[PDB]
Design a protein around this nucleic acid. Structure first.
Lengths: 309, 49, 78, 78, 77, 77
RNA sequence: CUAAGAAAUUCACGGCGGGCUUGAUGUCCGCGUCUACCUGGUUCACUGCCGUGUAGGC
């Protein structure tokens, strides 16, 4: 009847802060004690923070963990039981039509090619990704992927990619408990520049003499934010009104690349998350098979979706 | 630094806009608690009477 | 209200922890940032927020346990 | 009755401690909240409540030991 | 008398110290309470006793040293 | 603000690491430079930034865990 | 074209003296603040051919 005044969804696909280390190639099968790289200061009359591999290391290793929690349609808070029951019936109808297999395949594709290496993937020579399934503190299943053969644009097929998509689909459905450990080795070069996550500080002053650019670090170890990893492996959305050639972008309501300055899925056209969701739950209108993927991906991401009334 | 993803409950062309536009980012400050990178167990302790 | 105003207040939800608020010119630039867990860290955070965010004038306000670490009526006003 | 009114008053049931009240647009937003046990904490809490509540204008009232920490009439009224 | 009346008087047995009375619909709810020892705290106590107990309207009375801390648009409502 | 000021504040984005600010004669000379991951290195860097950047009248501010590694006479010049 | 037309109240002074406000007291009970997130466009330097000036290498 009416959209709820409060409506909140928890985060599935919950990552952690990616930790960086350095070493030599042909040693990835014993890399567990590699030294963590550190940020340093450098004067240019300004002071910047830079990061660099050691002069004996030519390979970067990034490590983080991942969970999938299941129960995508159930909201965390609500205000009327009618809208929640209609929403549960709608998402149950969706999962009874088709399970979480397309989204899981695109997530396993985004894990396969190491897209969470944002700017240190461009000048790479060879990338290798290793994914472990942790069951009881040990390793239950190992996947090893080549990331330069698995491109970014098109979504190809592979047997082990289907196996990882089955694991993520079983985790997203609610029939298992999946904990993944993701490690990525990139062969940048002997002592080249790595790119940690840049810092935003809302308390930094304005007068001159202040630091111009500081980087992220976790207990004197250069790291990447977890939200950048989430935005990296959330880029599965390609069914928008622009032509083919720009590539897939991330799943956001009014899906907008803010760094460029453009905003696809404007609310003047009927192709954003909110109106398609309102037509799905209120006016019994399914937009397409493709837009259901976008709406359910936007529910897996989560948010605060509340109309005033 | 995130995007503005909420219901634009004002007008489309608002003279006194009570929010901001979609092509611009919004910067926020939040608290967060995590586990350390080597610790995987959380312990919670209290007393009862 | 021309000078930048910096205030340091103690939270009563748990005692011994402070917060700092900065206002430069008619707008709040820092709201309730964690000062510390003792008067020394609160005084240090107040002087840090007055060093930057400051025009040629500023003003620091705090309790009589935090304003003892700041030098007496010398670095408190400008 | 347009600006936000901030009042700081000493508790007579034990001397030395203060409490703050904040009213905005005829509605009492803060009623008898603890400010502190010295005039400096009272002045810091009053300036914080004038910064957060009452965006266009404000008036700060209080004792003469408390208003000695705020600059004289420059930041008390707006 | 419909509105609330807050009167700040000075004690003539000890000059400099003030006291406050609140009227509140024809039966006094505060009698000779201790206001401050200076006009500023008397003004603060008067505005506190006008904020409470003055729900529709109020009138604040007092001396010229006391009412010099309240602007002229905040004394009557 | 004639005495040079040296403050040591803990960065709240990761607990346990410190940063020092140094101001001399109205303008700042060091803004948010890294110190160690323990109060000992932070106090040592505060002493080193007190030797340079002001020969007379330095002030060293910091926590009680930081100002416990230096003697009481070496905090205010 | 006025109950019209005119006009010096001027000086001085001692209000004084005393005092016991007294006691007494139980404010008191209860509680879910929840949810999501790309700091990024941006390190025109080091040192040399060279007496300046203006060629070049990475």
């Amino acid at each position: 009847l009416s959209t709820a005044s409060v409506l909140a969804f928890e985060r599935k696909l919950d990552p952690s802060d990616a930790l960086m280390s350095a070493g030599a190639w042909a040693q990835r099968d014993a890399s567990q004690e590699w030294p963590a790289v550190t940020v340093r200061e450098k004067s240019v009359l300004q002071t910047v923070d830079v990061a660099n591999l050691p002069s004996d290391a030519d390979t970067l290793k990034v490590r983080f963990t991942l969970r999938v929690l299941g129960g995508a349609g159930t909201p965390s808070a609500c205000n009327d039981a009618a809208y929640r029951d209609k929403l549960l019936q709608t998402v149950a109808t969706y999962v009874n039509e088709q399970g979480f297999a397309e989204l899981a395949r695109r997530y396993a594709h985004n894990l396969a090619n190491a897209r969470f290496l944002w700017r240190n993937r461009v000048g790479a020579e060879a990338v290798e990704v290793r994914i472990n399934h942790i069951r009881q503190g040990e390793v239950a299943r190992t996947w090893r992927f080549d990331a330069l053969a698995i491109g970014l644009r098109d979504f190809k097929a592979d047997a082990e990619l289907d196996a990882l998509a089955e694991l993520i689909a079983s985790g997203l459905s609610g029939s298992g408990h999946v904990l993944l450990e993701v490690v990525a080795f990139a062969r940048i070069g002997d002592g080249q520049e790595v790119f940690p996550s840049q810092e935003l500080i809302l308390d930094k002053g304005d007068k001159k003499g202040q630091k111009s650019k500081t980087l992220y670090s976790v207990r004197d170890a250069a790291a990447i934010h977890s939200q950048k990893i989430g935005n990296a492996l959330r880029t599965i959305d390609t069914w928008y009104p622009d032509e083919d050639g720009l590539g897939p972008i991330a799943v956001e309501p009014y899906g907008s690349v803010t760094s460029q300055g453009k905003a696809y899925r404007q609310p003047k056209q009927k192709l954003d998350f909110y109106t398609l969701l309102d037509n799905w739950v209120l006016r019994d209108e399914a937009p397409a098979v493709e837009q259901q993927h976008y709406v359910i991906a936007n529910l897996i991401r989560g948010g605060v979706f509340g109309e005033a009334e | 630094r995130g995007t503005i993803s909420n219901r634009l409950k004002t007008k489309d062309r608002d003279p006194a806009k009570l929010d901001a536009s979609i092509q611009s980012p919004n910067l926020q400050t939040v608290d967060v608690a995590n586990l350390p990178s080597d610790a995987d167990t959380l312990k919670v302790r209290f007393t009862l009477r | 209200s021309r000078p930048t105003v910096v205030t340091v207040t103690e939270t009563p939800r748990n005692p011994g922890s402070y917060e700092v608020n900065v206002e430069r010119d008619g707008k709040m630039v820092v709201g309730r940032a964690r000062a510390g867990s003792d008067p020394g860290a609160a005084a240090a955070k107040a002087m840090q927020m007055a060093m930057e965010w400051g025009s040629p004038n500023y003003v620091i306000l705090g309790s009589n346990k935090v304003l003892a670490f700041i030098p007496e009526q010398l670095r408190v006003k400008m």
